[PDB]
Amino acid sequence: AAVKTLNPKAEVARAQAALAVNISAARGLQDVLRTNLGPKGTMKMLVSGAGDIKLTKDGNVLLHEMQIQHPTASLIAKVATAQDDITGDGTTSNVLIIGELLKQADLYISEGLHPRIITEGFEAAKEKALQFLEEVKVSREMDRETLIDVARTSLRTKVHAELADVLTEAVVDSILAIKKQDEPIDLFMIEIMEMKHKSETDTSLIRGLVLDHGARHPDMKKRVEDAYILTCNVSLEYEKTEVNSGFFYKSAEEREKLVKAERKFIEDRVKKIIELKRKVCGDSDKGFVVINQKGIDPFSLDALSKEGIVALRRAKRRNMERLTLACGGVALNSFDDLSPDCLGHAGLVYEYTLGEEKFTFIEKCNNPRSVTLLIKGPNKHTLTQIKDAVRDGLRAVKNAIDDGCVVPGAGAVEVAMAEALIKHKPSVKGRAQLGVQAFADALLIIPKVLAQNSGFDLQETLVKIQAEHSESGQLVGVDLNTGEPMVAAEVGVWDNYCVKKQLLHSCTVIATNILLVDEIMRAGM
Amino acid sequence: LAGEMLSVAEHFLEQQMHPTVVISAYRKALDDMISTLKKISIPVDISDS
Amino acid sequence: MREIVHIQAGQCGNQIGAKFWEVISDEHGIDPTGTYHGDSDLQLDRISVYYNEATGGKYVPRAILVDLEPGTMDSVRSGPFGQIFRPDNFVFGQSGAGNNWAKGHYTEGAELVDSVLDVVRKEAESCDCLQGFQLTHSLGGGTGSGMGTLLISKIREEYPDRIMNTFSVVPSPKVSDTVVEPYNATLSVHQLVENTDETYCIDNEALYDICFRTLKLTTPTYGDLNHLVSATMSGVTTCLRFPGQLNADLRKLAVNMVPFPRLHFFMPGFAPLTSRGSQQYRALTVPELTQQVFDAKNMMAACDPRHGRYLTVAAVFRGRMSMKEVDEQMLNVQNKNSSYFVEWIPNNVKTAVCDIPPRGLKMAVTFIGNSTAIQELFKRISEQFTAMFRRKAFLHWYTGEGMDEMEFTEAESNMNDLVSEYQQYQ
Amino acid sequence: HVPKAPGFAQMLKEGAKHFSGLEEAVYRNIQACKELAQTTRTAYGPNGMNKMVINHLEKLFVTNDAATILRELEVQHPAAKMIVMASHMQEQEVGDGTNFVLVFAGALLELAEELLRIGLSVSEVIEGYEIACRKAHEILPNLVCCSAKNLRDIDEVSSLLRTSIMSKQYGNEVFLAKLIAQACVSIFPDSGHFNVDNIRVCKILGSGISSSSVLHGMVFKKETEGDVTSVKDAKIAVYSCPFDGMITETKGTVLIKTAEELMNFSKGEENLMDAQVKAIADTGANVVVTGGKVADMALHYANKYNIMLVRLNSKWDLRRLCKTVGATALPRLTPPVLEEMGHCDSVYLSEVGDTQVVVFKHEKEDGAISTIVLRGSTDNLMDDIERAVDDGVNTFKVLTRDKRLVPGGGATEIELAKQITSYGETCPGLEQYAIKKFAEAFEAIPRALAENSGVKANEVISKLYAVHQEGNKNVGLDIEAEVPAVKDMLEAGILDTYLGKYWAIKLATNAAVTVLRVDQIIMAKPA
Ligand SMILES: Nc1ncnc2c1ncn2[C@@H]1O[C@H](COP(=O)(O)OP(=O)(O)O)[C@@H](O)[C@H]1O
Numbered sequence A: 001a002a003v004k005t006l007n008p009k010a011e012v013a014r015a016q017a018a019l020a021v022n023i024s025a026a027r028g029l030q031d032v033l034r035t036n037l038g039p040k041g042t043m044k045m046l047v048s049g050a051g052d053i054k055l056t057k058d059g060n061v062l063l064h065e066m067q068i069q070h071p072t073a074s075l076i077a078k079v080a081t082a083q084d085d086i087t088g089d090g091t092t093s094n095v096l097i098i099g100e101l102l103k104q105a106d107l108y109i110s111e112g113l114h115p116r117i118i119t120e121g122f123e124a125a126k127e128k129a130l131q132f133l134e135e136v137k138v139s140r141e142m143d144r145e146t147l148i149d150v151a152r153t154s155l156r157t158k159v160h161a162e163l164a165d166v167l168t169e170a171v172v173d174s175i176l177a178i179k180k181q182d183e184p185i186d187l188f189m190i191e192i193m194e195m196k197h198k199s200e201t202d203t204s205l206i207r208g209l210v211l212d213h214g215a216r217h218p219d220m221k222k223r224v225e226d227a228y229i230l231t232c233n234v235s236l237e238y239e240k241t242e243v244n245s246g247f248f249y250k251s252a253e254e255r256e257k258l259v260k261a262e263r264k265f266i267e268d269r270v271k272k273i274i275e276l277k278r279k280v281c282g283d284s285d286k287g288f289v290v291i292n293q294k295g296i297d298p299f300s301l302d303a304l305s306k307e308g309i310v311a312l313r314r315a316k317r318r319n320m321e322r323l324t325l326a327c328g329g330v331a332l333n334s335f336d337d338l339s340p341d342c343l344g345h346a347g348l349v350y351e352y353t354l355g356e357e358k359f360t361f362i363e364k365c366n367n368p369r370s371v372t373l374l375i376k377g378p379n380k381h382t383l384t385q386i387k388d389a390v391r392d393g394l395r396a397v398k399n400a401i402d403d404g405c406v407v408p409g410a411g412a413v414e415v416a417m418a419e420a421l422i423k424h425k426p427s428v429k430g431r432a433q434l435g436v437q438a439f440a441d442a443l444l445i446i447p448k449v450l451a452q453n454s455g456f457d458l459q460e461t462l463v464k465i466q467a468e469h470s471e472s473g474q475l476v477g478v479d480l481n482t483g484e485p486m487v488a489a490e491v492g493v494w495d496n497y498c499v500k501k502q503l504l505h506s507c508t509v510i511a512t513n514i515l516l517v518d519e520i521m522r523a524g525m
Numbered sequence B: 001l002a003g004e005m006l007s008v009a010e011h012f013l014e015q016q017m018h019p020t021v022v023i024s025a026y027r028k029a030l031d032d033m034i035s036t037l038k039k040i041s042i043p044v045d046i047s048d049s
Numbered sequence C: 001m002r003e004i005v006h007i008q009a010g011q012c013g014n015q016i017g018a019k020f021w022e023v024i025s026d027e028h029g030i031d032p033t034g035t036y037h038g039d040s041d042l043q044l045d046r047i048s049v050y051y052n053e054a055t056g057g058k059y060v061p062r063a064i065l066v067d068l069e070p071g072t073m074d075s076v077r078s079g080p081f082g083q084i085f086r087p088d089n090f091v092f093g094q095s096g097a098g099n100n101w102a103k104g105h106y107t108e109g110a111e112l113v114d115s116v117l118d119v120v121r122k123e124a125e126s127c128d129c130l131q132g133f134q135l136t137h138s139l140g141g142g143t144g145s146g147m148g149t150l151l152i153s154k155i156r157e158e159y160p161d162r163i164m165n166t167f168s169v170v171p172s173p174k175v176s177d178t179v180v181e182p183y184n185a186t187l188s189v190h191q192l193v194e195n196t197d198e199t200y201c202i203d204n205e206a207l208y209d210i211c212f213r214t215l216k217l218t219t220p221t222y223g224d225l226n227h228l229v230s231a232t233m234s235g236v237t238t239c240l241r242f243p244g245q246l247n248a249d250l251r252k253l254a255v256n257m258v259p260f261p262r263l264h265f266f267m268p269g270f271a272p273l274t275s276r277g278s279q280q281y282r283a284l285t286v287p288e289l290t291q292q293v294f295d296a297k298n299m300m301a302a303c304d305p306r307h308g309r310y311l312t313v314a315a316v317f318r319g320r321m322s323m324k325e326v327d328e329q330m331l332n333v334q335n336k337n338s339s340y341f342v343e344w345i346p347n348n349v350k351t352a353v354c355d356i357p358p359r360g361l362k363m364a365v366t367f368i369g370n371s372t373a374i375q376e377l378f379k380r381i382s383e384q385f386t387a388m389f390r391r392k393a394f395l396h397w398y399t400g401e402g403m404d405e406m407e408f409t410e411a412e413s414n415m416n417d418l419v420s421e422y423q424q425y426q
Numbered sequence D: 001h002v003p004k005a006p007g008f009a010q011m012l013k014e015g016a017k018h019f020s021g022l023e024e025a026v027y028r029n030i031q032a033c034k035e036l037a038q039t040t041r042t043a044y045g046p047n048g049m050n051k052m053v054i055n056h057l058e059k060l061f062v063t064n065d066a067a068t069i070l071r072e073l074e075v076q077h078p079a080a081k082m083i084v085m086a087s088h089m090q091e092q093e094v095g096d097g098t099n100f101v102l103v104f105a106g107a108l109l110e111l112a113e114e115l116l117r118i119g120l121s122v123s124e125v126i127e128g129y130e131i132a133c134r135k136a137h138e139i140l141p142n143l144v145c146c147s148a149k150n151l152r153d154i155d156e157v158s159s160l161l162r163t164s165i166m167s168k169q170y171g172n173e174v175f176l177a178k179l180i181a182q183a184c185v186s187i188f189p190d191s192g193h194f195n196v197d198n199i200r201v202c203k204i205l206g207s208g209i210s211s212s213s214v215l216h217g218m219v220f221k222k223e224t225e226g227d228v229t230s231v232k233d234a235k236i237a238v239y240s241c242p243f244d245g246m247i248t249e250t251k252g253t254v255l256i257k258t259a260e261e262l263m264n265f266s267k268g269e270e271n272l273m274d275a276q277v278k279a280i281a282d283t284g285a286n287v288v289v290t291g292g293k294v295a296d297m298a299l300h301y302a303n304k305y306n307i308m309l310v311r312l313n314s315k316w317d318l319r320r321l322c323k324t325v326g327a328t329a330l331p332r333l334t335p336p337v338l339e340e341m342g343h344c345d346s347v348y349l350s351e352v353g354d355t356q357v358v359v360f361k362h363e364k365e366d367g368a369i370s371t372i373v374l375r376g377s378t379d380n381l382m383d384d385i386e387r388a389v390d391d392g393v394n395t396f397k398v399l400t401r402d403k404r405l406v407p408g409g410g411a412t413e414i415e416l417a418k419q420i421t422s423y424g425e426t427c428p429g430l431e432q433y434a435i436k437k438f439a440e441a442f443e444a445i446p447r448a449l450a451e452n453s454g455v456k457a458n459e460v461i462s463k464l465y466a467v468h469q470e471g472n473k474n475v476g477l478d479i480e481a482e483v484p485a486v487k488d489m490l491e492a493g494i495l496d497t498y499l500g501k502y503w504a505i506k507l508a509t510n511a512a513v514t515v516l517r518v519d520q521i522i523m524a525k526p527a
């Protein structure tokens, strides 16, 4: 080789050699990740070097937390990273298309043909697959019963179907009360808190917010009803000047006068708070809660506790965005224009301690537009199962609201798309006739893996499914309980349109680029 | 078969049973398996091809 | 009050940070699984400064360990007393930095630093009065320059008024690890003179000749390297962790170390330096340890204090001694060697002492102070930065992650302005 | 000559291992959790044995409670950590029954290997266990025979707390039941939230367990620095600031410009501190407790006006003292205290076991806080009784949340083994085999009680089903002597933690299901 002459410590791979490196590594990631596609998949226990258990079967967490050092596996992991970043689900099915787009193409390239001829057939097959996907999508005007079946499909494939009935009520009802009137739903308004209280099948949907820090004073009230939220960003603790100044005093009687005077600017901020409580008709209970993102010294905590004001400290950055919408106040950065217009309202503000760790709850709001899924998993690894499934389910219902159409389920899309490429296979009129055949057989791995994980036959299932599609017009699919071809649009199994659109685009470009690689080498030392 | 007869023997060792009791039950079961095969047997004509 | 949260970010920060808590847990007598083994208020009063007391008597160190590597921080997981921290103070990173400054900011830093700021928020809940933060990192490391520069900028959005005491491991002028070390050293310091106030300079490869000549070590390693660095780290945080007559916390150290806020590069060090066999055959007096820190044999960086001039001198002693002999001994050097000191400062050498002895040594002093010794080291970094950027060598490793050619131009103009900033009073 | 087998399809690990299949992953997770079930089987029950466990810090832990054993054993198997963390959740929820999780889930996975190797796979064992687990939570309200409702006093809760004590302290079951009765009932919140943090244990090295007692107050391990150790009025002023004066926070610097400001500065500092100590002597205070340090001038006027000083370096101990005497910790220096004073009955000092202690003893108004002063011959014995005391405090929190009880000692698990077997015989499906194996997992729990008592468990488990003929539902185990002839449990008084039995079945079933879901294991290189 030429690279061995210039650098003697530089490995290389030739034309017929680098193709066998990328294809055999794509089969290595395919044979591992095909055991978790669908509800009948198996759980994978992932142990790191420390010893912690990461029990999950999502395709993005499997590829990142896997001890593999391969250049081909690093290319598929980057495409799988963007699939779980912008649209959630569609990561396990992403790798299985690339694992079949390189295996079905190896049957032609090794039999005399050139790899560029196969890539010309992939673009002509992608044009028909994109037009066929727009004909099978179903617009259902974003009904709240439709979004249940969309969230149920994404949640079953990550849990054992006892928590899928609980998490669907916590995902669909959370995504509806955020934004209205054709507004893009921000996913930062949903807080995900990890608790340990009861059990995994006890995750509820808090209509307000759940803060992970409690009151930092023992004399404060633990349960406050009909409260006023005062969201602050000022620093109530003692701060000095920016210029280094210090103090200078002569006698000991002037020493105590400087300690009283150095807290005057601090107590002026506290006197603006306790006078706001007297201007909101404080002849009742009239609870007051200050979340107060910046820290508070215990001198001001003792002053606010005597008036009956609960004061938290050290809040998050987005806690001044979620609580501002939930309480309806104004997140102030100063106390120069304090007014009752910037105050919030909550019917119940209470705390609870779980092993010397308080959790502040804010509930009973009118129109919060900001909720919190309270995950109460028993173990530490069970919290990672629900959190990775909630964000897989929240991004599934967010795409079904933004896009106006719903795409059908398991085999109602991939089988019908492969049959459309057979009748349009002589439409290319050239050497790329076998490229459309390699793309149509690669899309059939989704009914093949789902029939394999459920325990049924692989080839006997695909004959009966393609027979019911060719002898009818209904988009029939795979049933993971009986094996008979069942329609996915009637049983309540749906999918996202942007997932299937990017599965035809991200997997096709990354397959046409890998097949055109013939000089895998390592230089730079 | 020896791996399975020891598989069921491990269950009784957890039940605070002495190994001489299980072996004395194995020898009584061994003498009855030989007598059962001789009752279900069939004579063969060795001259038949 | 005056709580300080410690942030050990980087590969070299966790190796120093592993032995940083070994000195504090031994001097204070804090049991890792019990409650305490102190004797009086010299050790039991300042527990709440660096530790948060849990319910039952167990003490937890206010420490955050950040690393973009699972295998590096696993030694601090279940190794030399690493099971004492919080479980959420072990933020791992599955994507390595690769000794690249642009990769740790735009690729790794865009997804991790929102979670690292959550650990500082949970540590600040148990702080009734947050004094500041410390940051131990390195310039020649990927995580030390990636998760050390981006972490120090996002912490000012939440803490704009609090002081900062950064610890920076400078690269060595003797040996080199990779050719992107002038790139990582120029970019990390260029955002460090912007809005910080304290930064030390420790050279690890320069200490291999100190252990070979003075500490009598034939084959040194990383374990013998960080032992005397931890003695220098404990010398600065001595009056912060032990009460005494010369009360000077980090707030009093931020003012009386720098007359100007930009020229905040110091030269740490300590004294004496004894081996494992020749330690008991040596007496330690007050003018013996006070006159050893000014020479070149007690420097933590590869610099020469015999051709420079100091600005502010602070020294912390260990042991009950007469501190009036320290000021009278150092005032006689300021009259005969006035070209090395300041001409208008009547008391250049400050005094600090405690009543807690160190580990191993009987008496010990530390040297904290800035001079023009960082000026000659900043010229060699900009000299290597000039020859590499003029050929534009390995710029696609940086510009492919989100950098540009104008990014290195502004990083070269202000770093050469810092050379002229130290060139005025030299 | 000799060839070898290389990698085949996906061997890309740099020193890591990979497990897949029923034999390499599922059956090896069963055999690893089977060894933890046989480990704590000896320490289960009133006749259980202790275990001297040495952790990485070379210190001794001797106990018979399975919760603190797993915290010191450095287990590295991943599926074995799932049964350790499930037993840790039993300690955080109810505080008792952590050994029940290791026996029940250890028998669930052991009988799961007898089902995967005989027939159906994990798709029906998991669905077969969850059917019998939901039916197991329906028999538990039907097995409640007594309730901890009538006469909530120190006489009735002494017998209700004997079961949690005798399982770890068999010989000291009577004296520890009286010490846990005079402490838990005295801190009652008058039908409110019961706090387990308001009971502290002061380990005093000395004589045996017969000298242990419960004092209404708090007992510390510090000194006075004064001569006012005899206080009978006990008006306590609590401060969190250091009792040494008032210094500023920014820099602090005295500036002298003339000779009148230098000479009068020393006398002006003494008159400033004298007016602050005498300000609390005019209010009637006797005990001044601070959190920080105390200067020499503060000790000069504390002994002059005859007020006692208490140094509390811990800040969590300072908050417990405010709930003891009913005071408020003042962050500022000494004010004229209006109404935030403390009020105790007797504050004194005494050297007990060569340890000078400070006792805030409440004579008449006894119920604000309780402290159990334990006396032991060794420091390791006082840790084992403190584990037995804290299990008695957590049992009192269970009876506050749910007053129902079930007959323990083996009487509950046999009735659970009989009703689940009735559901298994009436199940017209292939999942009935896992339901009958779920009832046999309850059979091994009184089997561990008979093996620790030196009795043959085959004759013990045969008499339990013979006396459970559809109407008794109460006969457990009589482990006081050999040749059992087992009797009733309501007559002997062995019944405890129905809510403890409710969470222990739910957590151990979810622990065994989580192991069976693991079909493929990918571990990393350990460091
Ligand atoms: N209830 C169901 N019935 C049939 N097929 C399903 C069902 N739920 C999910 N699937 C199929 O499983 C496939 C993978 O789902 P999922 O694992 O959530 O996404 P990914 O595999 O991309 O991570 C989908 O293509 C879908 O068709």
Ligand SMILES: Nc1ncnc2c1ncn2[C@@H]1O[C@H](COP(=O)(O)OP(=O)(O)O)[C@@H](O)[C@H]1O
Pocket: D043, D044, D045, D046, D066, D096, D097, D098, D099, D100, D101, D163, D166, D167, D408, D409, D410, D449, D476, D477, D478, D479, D494, D504
């Ligand atoms: N007096 C008694 N007679 C018979 N059995 C008893 C007696 N006291 C306790 N036991 C048994 O000892 C067992 C102790 O269980 P234990 O280890 O305390 O469970 P956990 O670890 O969940 O607290 C109980 O299951 C109970 O049946």
Ligand SMILES: [Mg+2]
Pocket: D096, D097, D163, D164, D165, D167, D168, D391
């Ligand atoms: Mg017990």
